[PDB]
UniProtKB/Swiss-Prot annotation:
Interacts with SERPINA1. This is Serine protease 1. It is found in: Secreted, Extracellular space. GO terms for molecular function: endopeptidase activity; metal ion binding; serine-type endopeptidase activity; serpin family protein binding. Synthesized in the acinar cells of the pancreas. It comes from Bos taurus (Bovine). Keywords: Calcium, Digestion, Disulfide bond, Hydrolase, Metal-binding, Protease, Secreted, Serine protease, Signal, Zymogen. Its EC number is 3.4.21.4.
Length: 193
């Protein structure tokens, strides 16, 4: 469904000439996205609703650095996470806001908000599926760094106010990078860059 303009203020659009992936603002200088979204010349677009019209609340900021997870495997999408640094800090406001990293993993059954990009932001509320339901849908392919939820990519999966997933792959529920496994890496990496 249509989220409503700026109702997901941590949602970002990654643009290299066009919207190629979503991401999540985790502080004024850093965005989390999927490693499979990696490409050169990224501009981070904050405060977006319609990605084809300047509506008045946008901030466009060039990325200064991208860091793909050291263990990212593009064949399997294991460890599908990357960090993007903003060249200048975003000006935080009601429509441009960070989302908190988790301190613990979410449980099966927890409802989450998945969002991403006709040209306005779309939303889906869906529960995290059991481990078994997830792995049964994709035998051989699910690792401990993935979860499924259900009944673009790189965008957020937010549960109880925490960024628990990144839109990674699918076909059959969606498969999401399990952010709670990466919090130490995220925190150390951003602090060191
Ligand atoms: Ca816009």
């Amino acid at each position: 469904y249509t989220c409503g303009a700026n109702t997901v203020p941590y949602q970002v659009s990654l643009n290299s000439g066009y919207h190629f992936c979503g991401g999540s603002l985790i502080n004024s200088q850093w965005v989390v996205s999927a490693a499979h979204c990696y490409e050169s010349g990224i501009q981070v677009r904050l405060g977006e609703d319609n990605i084809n019209v300047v509506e008045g609340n946008e901030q466009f900021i060039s990325a200064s650095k991208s860091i793909v997870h050291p263990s990212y495997n593009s064949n399997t999408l294991n460890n599908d996470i990357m960090l993007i640094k903003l060249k200048s800090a975003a000006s935080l406001n009601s429509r441009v806001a960070s989302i908190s990293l988790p301190t613990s993993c979410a449980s099966a059954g927890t409802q989450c908000l998945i969002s991403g990009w006709p040209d306005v932001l779309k939303c889906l509320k869906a529960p995290i599926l059991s481990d078994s339901s997830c792995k049964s849908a994709y035998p051989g392919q699910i690792t401990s760094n993935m979860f499924c939820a259900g009944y673009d990519s790189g965008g957020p999966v937010v549960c109880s106010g925490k960024l628990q997933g990144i839109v990674s792959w699918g076909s059959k529920p969606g498969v999401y990078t399990k952010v709670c496994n990466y919090v130490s890496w995220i925190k150390q990496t951003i602090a060191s860059n």
